[PDB]
């Protein structure tokens, strides 16, 4: 299954957002992060990727397709707008084993507000 996440300057949740900001996919599914607005990328957040997965970082303005392999919760950010809260969460598969350690990861205040909302949106 293929899903799309749009990178926008402004959306329903305020400035600098990924829409949707919370998504659940199956192990092996692909998500394309689309630069609807220019000046954004996607990068995994330190401490917010499961065991066996590798970190990734796309280039500014590229349409970036990612096939999620390792099951778990992945926190993603937009590099330049991380301090402004441009973040999202991708849950891969059921019963993520790192969900509890992703909740304790440290992020700038605006990003933490949005991550907490996104994490609660998946059933915590
Ligand atoms: Cu951005």
64-102 burial code (b ≥16 CB/10 A, e <16): bebebebbbbbbbbbeebbebbbbbbbbbbeebebbeeb
Q: Alpha-carbon distance 10 to 105, whole Å?
A: 26
Q: Resolution limit in angstroms?
A: 1.5
78 annotated ligand-binding residue: yes
The residue assigned the tokens 């066996």 is 52
Sign of the dihedral defined by the CA atoms of residues 80, 86, 92, 94, in that order: positive
Q: What are phi and psi of 45, to 5 degrees?
A: -85, 130
Tokens standing for residue 50:
């499961």
Distance from Cα 7 to the centre of ligand 1, integer Å: 7
Question: Comparing C-alpha atoms, which of 59, 84, 44, 61 is closest to residue 7?
Answer: 61
Tokens standing for residue 113:
């507000």
- Per-residue CA distances from 72 to 55, 83, 101 (Å): 13, 24, 11
Domain 1-124 has CATH 2.60.40.420: yes
Q: Alpha-carbon distance 18 to 100, whole Å?
A: 23
In this structure, are residues 81 and 108 in contact, taking their beta carbons and an 8 Å threshold?
A: no
86 annotated ligand-binding residue: yes
83 DSSP 8-state letter:
G
Distance from Cα 10 to the centre of ligand 1, integer Å: 10
User: What 3-state class would DSSP assign to 108?
Assistant: coil
How many Cβ atoms are within 10 Å of 50's Cβ, its own excluded? 20
Distance from Cα 97 to the centre of ligand 1, integer Å: 28
Task: Tell me the H-state helices in the chain.
Answer: 99-103, 109-121
Q: How was this structure determined?
A: X-ray
Question: Comparing C-alpha atoms, which of 54, 59, 27 is closest to residue 42?
Answer: 59
Those residues with Cβ within 8 angstroms of residue 62's Cβ, 6 or more apart along the chain or in another chain: 35, 41
User: What 3-state class would DSSP assign to 51?
Assistant: coil
């Amino acid at each position: 299954a293929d899903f799309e996440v749009h990178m926008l300057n402004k959306g329903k949740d305020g400035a600098m957002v990924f829409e949707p900001a919370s998504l659940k996919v199956a192990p092996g599914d692909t998500v394309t992060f689309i630069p609807t607005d220019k000046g954004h990328n996607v990068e995994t957040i330190k401490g917010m990727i499961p065991d066996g997965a590798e970190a990734f970082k796309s280039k500014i303005n590229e349409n970036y397709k990612v096939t999620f392999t390792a099951p778990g919760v992945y926190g993603v950010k937009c590099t330049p707008h991380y301090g402004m809260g441009m973040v999202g969460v991708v849950q891969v598969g059921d019963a993520p084993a790192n969900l509890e350690a992703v909740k304790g990861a440290k992020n700038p205040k605006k990003a933490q507000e949005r991550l907490d909302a996104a994490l609660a949106a998946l059933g915590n």
